[PDB]
Every structure is written in C-alpha cells, then in structure tokens.
C-alpha cells in the first residue's frame, strides 16, 4: 500500500492514486474514494497534494 | 379549553415584556458584581503598598467560613407570642437497599 502517483504525475481517469488502510490522505478535487479508502482519479490531469 | 385570540395575544405580549424585564435584572446583578470586585481588588492593592505582611493574610482562605448556612426569607415575620398546636413528626421515607 501507499502512494502510486506522486506530486506532479500525470494520471488518467480511473488511475489509483493511493491505497491505505486508514485515512492518511483525503480525497480532494476530482478524486474519488472507494470502499477500502482507495483514492482514484476522476479526471485526466496532474496530481497535487 | 381553547384559548381566545385576545388571550393568546395578551400572553404573547406579556412574554415580550418579561424578556426585557429579566434583561435588566441581570444587568444590575452584572454591574453590582463588577463594583464589588473592583473595590476589593483596588483595596488589596492599597493594602500591599502599606504593609505586604497584611496583604498575605487577607488573600488566604478562611477555613471557619464553611459550612455556611442561611435560610430564605419568610412571607410574614415571627409573632412574639404565638403558641403552636401539639403534634408529632413521623418519617415514612421508603428505605432502598441493594441485594445482589
């Protein structure tokens, strides 16, 4: 588990940004969250923290 | 019984004058406390300048103070020569006891 896409990386819609067992990172703009607190990209673009 | 329009009108208008009357009771009580506290703190300062030995005794607590008992006023004062009837006081307070 952990970050799959770091700051500045380009992602496509659906790409998983981070996996976690507890909420270490929270979903912001155009970032979804699944059952298991998995953060995924809702749009194509650049990742920012 | 249903309440007449004039009745509710009077009650509602009475609770609007009662919210402002209690606002002045609290204002006087708030100011009175301030006066008391401002006079006490200012007297202690003048006492420190005169003799810091007495100021160290005044700021100390008074163990004789508590327990502090006080009964509330009456509606009519005691009569000088009044003899009550004869009787007896019997407690019937249910005693509760814990088993198990």
């Amino acid at each position: 588990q952990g970050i799959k896409k770091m700051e500045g990386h380009y992602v496509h819609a659906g790409n998983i940004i981070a996996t976690q067992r507890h909420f270490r990172w929270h979903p912001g703009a155009h970032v979804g969250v699944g059952k298991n607190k998995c953060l995924y990209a809702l749009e194509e673009g650049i990742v920012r923290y | 019984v249903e309440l007449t329009f004039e009745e509710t009108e009077r009650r509602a208008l009475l609770l609007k004058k009662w919210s402002l009357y209690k606002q002045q009771e609290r204002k006087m009580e708030r100011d009175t406390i301030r006066a008391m506290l401002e006079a006490q703190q200012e007297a202690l300062e003048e006492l420190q300048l005169e003799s810091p030995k007495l100021h160290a005794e005044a700021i100390k607590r008074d163990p004789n103070l508590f327990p502090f008992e006080k009964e509330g006023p009456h509606y009519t004062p005691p009569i000088p020569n009044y003899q009550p009837p004869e009787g007896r006081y019997n407690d019937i307070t249910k005693v509760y006891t814990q088993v198990e």
Partner: protein, 120 residues
C-alpha cells in the same frame, strides 16, 4: 457538459455543483447568497439594505427569511440563474425559517437541484 468539482467525500459541504444557495443568518440580520463553485457571488439579498429593511418589522424573524427568498428568486431569474443546490445541516433543514425560504424560492421559479452532467 461542464465538469463539476467532484470529490471531497470525507468533508462537508460538497463541491459537485455549478451554483449554490448559501444562507447566512446572524443575531440581527438574514443574508442569502448565490455563488459559483469558484467562489464568486452572482446575486445576493440581505436585510441590511434599506430596500428590504424599510418594509420588515423584524429582520431576524421567519418572515424576513421568507421575504429574502421572494426577493432572491426574482433576482435570480433576472440574472438567468434557474438551478442551484442547497446544502443545509440537519437542524437548519428542519427549521421553519428554512422551509419557508425554499418554498419561496420554488414559487419564484428556482429549482433547488441542478441537472445531472452529460458525459457522453
């Protein structure tokens, strides 16, 4: 077809909207705002302005809230705003002052839900 700012599922309020109705009621006044997701304010209606204050007995009562919706709905139609979301709290939504502000906005022609975005 414009994308909404989806996300923010672990916080409050949401951002998945184009326009938002935000109600601010203080100890003395009541204010309703229509603002865009970017923060800009489009139209507003407050009891601080003489126009509305000269006709109200109390600026902080239910009537004031009901009258702020009748004035805001009329201003949202002129601006072109016909849909917007409202994000209240459980105690705000159950209040009789917010129930009358919504009814006043709908009777004015404003819909308190935005249409779904078209992706395809």
């Amino acid at each position: 077809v414009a994308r909404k700012e989806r996300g923010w599922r672990t916080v409050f309020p949401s951002r998945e909207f184009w326009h938002r109705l935000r109600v601010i009621r203080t100890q003395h006044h009541v204010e309703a705002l229509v603002e865009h997701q970017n923060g800009k304010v489009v139209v507003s209606a407050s009891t601080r302005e003489w126009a509305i204050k000269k006709h109200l007995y109390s600026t902080r009562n239910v009537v004031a809230c009901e009258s702020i919706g009748r004035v805001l709905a009329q201003r949202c139609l002129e601006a072109g705003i016909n849909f917007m979301v409202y994000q209240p709290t459980p105690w705000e939504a159950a209040s009789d002052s917010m129930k009358r502000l919504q009814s006043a906005m709908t009777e004015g022609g404003v819909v308190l839900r935005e249409p779904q975005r078209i992706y395809e």
